């Protein structure tokens, strides 16, 4: 190579983490300003020009706010759960292609990597809620466990239908395969279902049961203050963007367009971000449109509506592939 391995690895990680953590801060302001417009409001417009420094004041305010360790709380776990949720939520950005193979890890199995990292971070929510040893946080954590028993099979079922078309499990190859057609056209029911599960996966509304404010006070994060609360917020909003990126990876062609490398690489980055930003809007639009579902009804919806339909596609879709001679070669090509 031309320069050091460690430096190339260094600047690539920075170019991924730093712009993403900046992107996370603006989704929080953007949601507050988007719902307000739907609510005939303005949203943040006085912490920085047009309100563009609001997330930083919120972040800085909490890192200077006193932490409390409850006497009834198992304290090592009280701190371990938010730290697990944050680290393991942010790890999911290590396999996103911002171009063909332009990922921190172009892994051959990056889809399974994302399922492992998301599942491990939800276990922090469960642990932190239980550790608090307060009723509402206890009821919050039990809902989060019910919720993962609801959406995890749904996403894993949905993605397996994308892998049947792509044949790869590598995020770049799936995007490259969509140069034929975006997977939202042939897999239109799967796109709706995967999007529904992603909203449930992120504990976003209408599925905000674990942290519901009108039923529990803050659910799992009710005893959590200062930096611990901020760890859970960055995990949640970083999960929203990551799931919007993954939905764009799997159904909307990823980075596909709708000095010379820099000009080209920019178009891939914009194209992925534009499609991600549209799906980020759909989340915020969804929180603003609907009531909260009841947690019994979310479990029944995933288990008697979504999964029965997804199992039937899992049968139907390969039968269409063998019939039309369109099973993808599973070798390395794209």
């Amino acid at each position: 190579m031309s320069y050091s391995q460690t430096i190339n690895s260094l600047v690539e990680v920075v170019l991924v983490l730093v712009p993403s953590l900046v992107g996370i801060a603006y989704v929080t302001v953007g949601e507050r300003k988007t719902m307000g417009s739907m609510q005939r409001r303005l949203g943040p417009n006085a912490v920085g020009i047009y309100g563009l420094l609001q997330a930083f004041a919120d972040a800085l305010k909490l890192l200077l706010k006193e932490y409390v360790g409850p006497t009834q709380a198992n304290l090592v776990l009280f701190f371990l759960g938010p730290v697990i949720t944050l680290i393991f939520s942010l790890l999911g950005y290590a396999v996103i292609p911002y171009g063909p193979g332009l990922a921190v890890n172009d892994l051959s199995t990056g889809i399974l990597y994302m399922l492992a990292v998301s599942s491990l971070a939800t276990y922090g929510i469960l642990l932190a809620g239980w550790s608090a040893n307060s009723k509402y946080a206890f009821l919050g954590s039990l809902r989060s466990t019910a919720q993962l028993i609801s959406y995890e099979l749904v996403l894993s079922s949905s993605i397996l239908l994308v892998i049947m078309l792509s044949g790869s499990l590598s995020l770049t190859v799936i995007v490259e395969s969509q140069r034929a057609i975006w997977y939202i056209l042939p897999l239109l029911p799967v796109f709706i279902i995967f999007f529904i599960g992603s909203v449930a996966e992120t504990n976003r509304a209408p599925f905000d049961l674990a942290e519901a404010e009108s039923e529990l006070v803050s659910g799992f994060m009710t005893e959590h203050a200062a930096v611990i609360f901020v760890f859970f917020f960055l995990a949640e909003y970083g999960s929203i963007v990551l799931m919007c990126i993954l939905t764009s990876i799997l159904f909307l062609g990823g980075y596909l367009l709708i000095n010379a490398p820099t000009v080209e690489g920019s178009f891939y980055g914009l194209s992925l971000g534009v499609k991600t930003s549209i799906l980020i809007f759909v989340f915020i639009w969804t929180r603003a449109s609907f009531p909260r579902i009841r947690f019994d009804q979310l479990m029944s919806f995933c288990w008697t509506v979504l999964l029965p339909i997804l199992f039937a596609l899992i049968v139907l879709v390969p039968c269409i592939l063998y019939s039309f001679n369109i099973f993808p070669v599973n070798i390395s090509l794209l």
Binding site: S37, M38, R40, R41, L42, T286, A288, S289, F290
Partner: protein, 185 residues
């Protein structure tokens, strides 16, 4: 339950309709179920709100609307000569519903019936306006002022010195509010 006499005509509900009596087509019913149709309409209605003017005003640079009858902080008022209008009748002390007014009077050096004490406990007041309603001479009024929040509660115990100072400062509105609202009183 229902009114006595003949029962209301057609108060009894029609017999229930069966599943195969509902006159909706399967294509429509199944389409609405799977396409999430009614909730797409709600999503759209939010979209046209998104492209409507907001309602928001930029307080404190812009203020919401208040009327001449608005009841704000208290002020004691004077005649055009600078003589106090208050004559110590004690009517407002009597009518107060919260006993926030304490008045002590005497004959002044010149033999005038004037107050020696005039206190309003602004943390006992209910801001009803009954005291300005009862005044025979338009002395006690409630200003259009609502922005007078303080650091301590001692700052909310107004004596005659604070209330006359309020009238001395706010007289142009107090006069314009009375002018605009007097015929209705």
């Amino acid at each position: 339950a229902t009114p006595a006499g003949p029962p209301p005509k057609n108060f009894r509900l029609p017999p229930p309709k069966n599943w195969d009596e509902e006159s909706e087509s399967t294509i429509d019913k199944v389409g609405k179920y799977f396409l999430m149709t009614e909730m797409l309409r709600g999503m759209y209605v939010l979209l046209e709100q998104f492209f409507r003017p907001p309602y928001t005003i930029y307080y404190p640079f812009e203020k919401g609307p208040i009327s001449p009858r608005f009841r704000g902080e208290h002020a004691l008022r004077r005649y055009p000569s600078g003589e106090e209008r208050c004559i110590a009748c004690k009517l407002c002390e009597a009518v107060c519903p919260a006993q926030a007014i304490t008045i002590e009077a005497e004959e002044r050096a010149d033999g005038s019936r004037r107050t020696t004490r005039y206190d309003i406990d602004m943390t006992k007041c209910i801001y009803c306006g009954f005291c300005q309603e009862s005044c025979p001479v338009d002395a006690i009024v409630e200003s259009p002022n609502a922005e007078y929040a303080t650091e301590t509660r001692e700052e909310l115990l107004y004596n005659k010195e604070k209330l006359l100072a309020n009238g001395d400062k706010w007289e142009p509105e107090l006069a314009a509010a009375i002018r605009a609202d007097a015929p209705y009183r």
